């Protein structure tokens, strides 16, 4: 008799990409704005974070998913709602009618 078989699969998987995450955080006074920013201020992973008190918005430029940042944002005590998990701009060429 004789036999021979195998079932191995090389282990190779790279997952890493920096994207912009828009989170609508309900702010009231500076404090809230100071805490929201700090919560993600120079924090491992996070590369940038924008906080708009005018539109109670709060962006977060990190390689981590919204589900990951969401928790970090909620940790401050406020409610972080996802209003955009991506970006994209479309330009147009040609003369305009004026």
UniProtKB/Swiss-Prot annotation:
Post-translational modification as stated in the protein's UniProt record: Ubiquitinion by XIAP/BIRC4 leads to enhancement of its chaperone activity toward its physiologic target, SOD1, rather than proteasomal degradation.
Binding site for Cu cation 1: 29, 32
Location of the protein in the cell: Cytoplasm
Domain of life of the native organism: Eukaryota
Residues that span the membrane, as ranges: none
Domain HMA: 18-81
Residue ranges the record marks as coiled coil: none
Per UniProt, location of the Glycyl lysine isopeptide (Lys-Gly) (interchain with G-Cter in ubiquitin) cross-link in this chain: 83
Tissues/organs with expression: Ubiquitous.
Subunit structure: Homodimer, and heterodimer with SOD1. Interacts with COMMD1. Interacts with XIAP/BIRC4. Interacts with SLC31A1(via C-terminal domain); this interaction is Cu(1+)-mediated. The heterodimer CCS:SOD1 interacts with SLC31A1; this heterotrimer is Cu(1+)-mediated and its maintenance is regulated through SOD1 activation.
Free-text function comment from the UniProt entry: Delivers copper to copper zinc superoxide dismutase (SOD1).
Family: In the C-terminal section; belongs to the Cu-Zn superoxide dismutase family.
Protein name listed in UniProt: Copper chaperone for superoxide dismutase
Provenance organism: Homo sapiens (Human)
């Amino acid at each position: 008799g004789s036999s021979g078989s195998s079932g191995m699969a090389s282990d190779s998987g790279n997952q890493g990409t920096l994207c912009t995450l828009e989170f609508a955080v309900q702010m009231t006074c500076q404090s809230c704005v100071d805490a929201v920013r700090k919560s993600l201020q120079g924090v491992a992973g996070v590369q940038d974070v924008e906080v708009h008190l005018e539109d109670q918005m709060v962006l977060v430029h990190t390689t981590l998913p919204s589900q990951e940042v969401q928790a970090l944002l909620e940790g401050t005590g406020r409610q972080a709602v996802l209003k955009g998990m991506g970006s994209g701009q479309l330009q147009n060429s040609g003369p305009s009618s004026g």
